[model samples]
Target: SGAIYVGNYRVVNRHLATHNDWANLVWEDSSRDLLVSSTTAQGCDTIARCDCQTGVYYCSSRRKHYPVSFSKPSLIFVEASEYYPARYQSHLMLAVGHSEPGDCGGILRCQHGVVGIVSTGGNGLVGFADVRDLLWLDE
Candidate 1:
């Protein structure tokens, strides 16, 4: 299951990046574990969803149509990279993971004391302070 953030709207659908008419999720026989996209859009814009997930899915963004979710259960990991934020005059990190090699997972941001992780889109992750006890759970 994957998701895409469009402007203030978030298309948190399981196959939003996979089963769409224009973009279809392709399975590569060479790289058996990879889910590649068939699209002309290059760079970061082309890809933006996690491989899979488990338990009940919850979408922070309440998109009118499709919500953030997956069919059953699969292994999805959260990876965080550390960096310094000047606004808070401290440090913060980005939560992203790898699909193949160059691809990334998502960005984690905090509102008040609550933190939310979503795919990169129009509203790029800019401001943040620190994530409370955050770490990369998978490779």
Candidate 2:
């Protein structure tokens, strides 16, 4: 649910990144979150994915500005299931995918709109931003 993009389920289901045999939807207890990989190769290859929605889930690329980059090195999809509120939306900002000193666990940063808020696990909130919402892709 990161980004609809082209919905290349057929292609994605075969790619090494998404189907690296060992790389499947994993529930990391240490991180206490669902860790998964997108269609990325790494190194020289960069991440590319369509910005189907706002939030960090959407990917970026220098070539095809529309299609999401899938070769970004090490760029992992922090499963949204880890997020709270049973009815979480698709583009909702959940966590920053990073931890801090004795942070234990929790949302590192969350935002709704207009640079909502940057709150970490250990430190409540560090700062704020007025980043504009991503331009819609469909239309």
Candidate 3:
């Protein structure tokens, strides 16, 4: 009921944007434009759709079904830039902009977009470039 884990990486469902228009805002570009909403936000014959159970929503695609919580973290990710030629380029990305750190704390470096977050832990997920990664792309 928390973050969905792919391989080993997990993007807590608690981190998704809980905008009033969340159904409209929850999306990704897995190279394909699809809406992860109650009705798959689709027309007839659309493969996109979601279901709710025990208060949690489970969204599905042709390949996978993941938990969809319309809540987001206090810290906002404006933009991200990877460290060029950086070793093991997963879990970390340079800031492209600044944002309110919420509880994550501003104690970390975010100046000049020079700082970022790293996935210090995970399994089966060697990097953050999996399906779940896209969910954490924004909000």
Candidate 4:
């Protein structure tokens, strides 16, 4: 489901090296440190805590993806940095990075670490910082 895979044992190693012990690892950091996990992995309650009958998982504090439609011969944002700024900041793609001689290439500049401003034809777009600009382009 993600770019990396982790098992219970890996979490254990991470805890032992970083935190004092299992319980301390989950309970030590009061600064958002209430996460606990099981020794067997699934039995733990750090990332996902289960109190016998009920289990809970923490949700990320981030905005959702709001797709922006583009027109012909215009630059487009290949990525949305707001969804997961830290993770998606540097990732960007375009239907066309460049245009050929008969189809000249446009300009694409990644202003923010997570997003890029692509100029397609005459119109260009900046990333999350200028999300509002998208509305203008839409109309």
Which candidate gets the maximum TM-score versus the true structure?
Answer: 1
TM-score of 4: 0.14
lDDT of 2 at 115: 21
Ranking by TM-score: 1, 3, 2, 4
Q: Per-residue alpha-carbon lDDT of model 2 for 1-139, expressed as tens digits? A: 1111212111111111234423533222122222332333322211223322233222111111111111211223232333332331222233333323222211111133222222112232111111123232111
lDDT of 2: 0.23
Model 1 per-residue lDDT tens digits across residues 69-128: 222222232233232121222222322222221122233322221232232222222221
Candidates 2 and 4, the one with greater lDDT: 2
lDDT tens digits, residue span 20-125, model 4: 3455443222211112232343222122111121111111111122234322222233322222122222212323122221121111212121122221111233
> What's the count of clashing pairs in each model shown?
0, 11, 6, 13
Q: Give me the runs in candidate 2 sitting further than 4 Å from their true place.
A: 2-27, 36-40, 43-139
| Per-prediction TM-score to the true structure, in the order listed | 0.20, 0.16, 0.17, 0.14
What lDDT would candidate 1 get against the real structure? 0.26
Model 3: per-residue lDDT, tens digit, 1-139? 1232222222222233244324444443222111232222222211111221111111111122222112111222222323122233222322212222221111121111111121211231111112222433322
User: lDDT for every model?
Assistant: 0.26, 0.23, 0.23, 0.22
Output the worst ten-in-a-row residue range by lDDT, candidate 3: 52-61
